Amino acid sequence: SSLHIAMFPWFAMGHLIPYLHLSNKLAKRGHKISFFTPKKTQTKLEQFNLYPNLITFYPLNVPHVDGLPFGAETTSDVAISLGPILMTAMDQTQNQIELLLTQLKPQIIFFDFVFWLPKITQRLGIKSFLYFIINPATISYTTSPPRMFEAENLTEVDLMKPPKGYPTSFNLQSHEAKHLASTRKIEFGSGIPFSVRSYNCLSLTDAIGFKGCREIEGPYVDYLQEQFGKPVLLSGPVLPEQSKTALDEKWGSWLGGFKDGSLVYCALGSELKLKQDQFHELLLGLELTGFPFLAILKPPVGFETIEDALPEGFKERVKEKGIVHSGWIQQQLILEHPSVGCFVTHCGAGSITEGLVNNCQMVLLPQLNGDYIINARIMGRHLKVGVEVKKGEEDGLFTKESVYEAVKIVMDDENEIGREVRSNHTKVRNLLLRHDLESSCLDTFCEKLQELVS
Numbered sequence: 001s002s003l004h005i006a007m008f009p010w011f012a013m014g015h016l017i018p019y020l021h022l023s024n025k026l027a028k029r030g031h032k033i034s035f036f037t038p039k040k041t042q043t044k045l046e047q048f049n050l051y052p053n054l055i056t057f058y059p060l061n062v063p064h065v066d067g068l069p070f071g072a073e074t075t076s077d078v079a080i081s082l083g084p085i086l087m088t089a090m091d092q093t094q095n096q097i098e099l100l101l102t103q104l105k106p107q108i109i110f111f112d113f114v115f116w117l118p119k120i121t122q123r124l125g126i127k128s129f130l131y132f133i134i135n136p137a138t139i140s141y142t143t144s145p146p147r148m149f150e151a152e153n154l155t156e157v158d159l160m161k162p163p164k165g166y167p168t169s170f171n172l173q174s175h176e177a178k179h180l181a182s183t184r185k186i187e188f189g190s191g192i193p194f195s196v197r198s199y200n201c202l203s204l205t206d207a208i209g210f211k212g213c214r215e216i217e218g219p220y221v222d223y224l225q226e227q228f229g230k231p232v233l234l235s236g237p238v239l240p241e242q243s244k245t246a247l248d249e250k251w252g253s254w255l256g257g258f259k260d261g262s263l264v265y266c267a268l269g270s271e272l273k274l275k276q277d278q279f280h281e282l283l284l285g286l287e288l289t290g291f292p293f294l295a296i297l298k299p300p301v302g303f304e305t306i307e308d309a310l311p312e313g314f315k316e317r318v319k320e321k322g323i324v325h326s327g328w329i330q331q332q333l334i335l336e337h338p339s340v341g342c343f344v345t346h347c348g349a350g351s352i353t354e355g356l357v358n359n360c361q362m363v364l365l366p367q368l369n370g371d372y373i374i375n376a377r378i379m380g381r382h383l384k385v386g387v388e389v390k391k392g393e394e395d396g397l398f399t400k401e402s403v404y405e406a407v408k409i410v411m412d413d414e415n416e417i418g419r420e421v422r423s424n425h426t427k428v429r430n431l432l433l434r435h436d437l438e439s440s441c442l443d444t445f446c447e448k449l450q451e452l453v454s
């Protein structure tokens, strides 16, 4: 029998998009989806709804919080330092969420962050499902019980090593462990420290799920199920679904002028702005390669346009071989274009999946966020499907020569590291795209969801 599932992701394109990809896969199996989205944002999500008779959007009015830019609904509308105020606003949707649950009566609700929800749902006889679209390796590293009983005695040297029990080994740099130790204590919505919020969610939910498959995420899902004593499910790798909107003819024509596999695509997601020094180093490093390139970047901190921030003489030298562009583009469609030979990525979980299912060589340029950092280590050191750009151990900055070197290595057909990461990427792509991999993951997923509502 088909399930009625409500979807309540965090107000960010990096959560909305994979929740919608998964919604389409569940609707294809006959399940009914009630998708809660900020009101104005719904118009940009319609293109991804492939089953309008089963997936219905329900708008949320994102309420005012002191400091929130007017009319802001998602992390694409606010600076990254304003995220905690946006999460206060999400907390404040509780009244209209409770209204929607009592009228719609879903059997399950998938959610992020809102640890007050499981109390509402169990009063209504609804199962709460904490569904992560980031890597369970990240949650396993930062928010497993061993980390949380240390409370404020958790130091940067503590975060250099993995918690007790952790299933794999990798190294963080000093500045990364320092970032994890500080941001963990920062208030993220309604005065709750970030790690306390997420540990409340893990503790109070009925079940937990992650994007991923047994072959890659399995060891971390096992570790978390042992730690938290409740079901920890895998949805499958959430392979991107096809949009109802074809590739913008302006990008299609320009990309089509380049030799197959010759172009470097660089994008750092939907939220962040580089400091001007690192913006310059990145662009000068791409220029050094002599390859054509498309860099999708916001203007650096303190600047409002790309043109004002470009290194001197840059546009004149680069001419028609390279473009630096600030707007939202159809990244998934660009990564499938045959001209793209290299993807320089901030290692967001969605961008990683999009890169892995395509042919591009991966250059890892993780920005300062726990999931990006841990994704980069797993891709660089465990799966060995990409080359990571060297950063300063203490300052977290890169040089233009390190960007240049990483791209050169993966683009050079005779470079044995480049050939090795290409071969490993092919192995991972062949796994993710195996004819029965996603379908058997979703088979198990749906059986376990049925168990949950039984």
Ligand SMILES: O=c1ccn([C@@H]2O[C@H](COP(=O)(O)OP(=O)(O)O)[C@@H](O)[C@H]2O)c(=O)[nH]1
Pocket: 012, 013, 014, 015, 017, 267, 268, 269, 270, 271, 296, 327, 328, 329, 330, 331, 332, 347, 348, 349, 350, 351, 352, 354
């Ligand atoms: O101009 C852009 C920027 C981003 N994306 C998409 O936005 C998502 C970003 O998710 P990810 O987990 O990579 O990173 P985040 O935005 O959370 O840092 C991915 O699906 C990208 O394909 C896009 O389509 N166009």
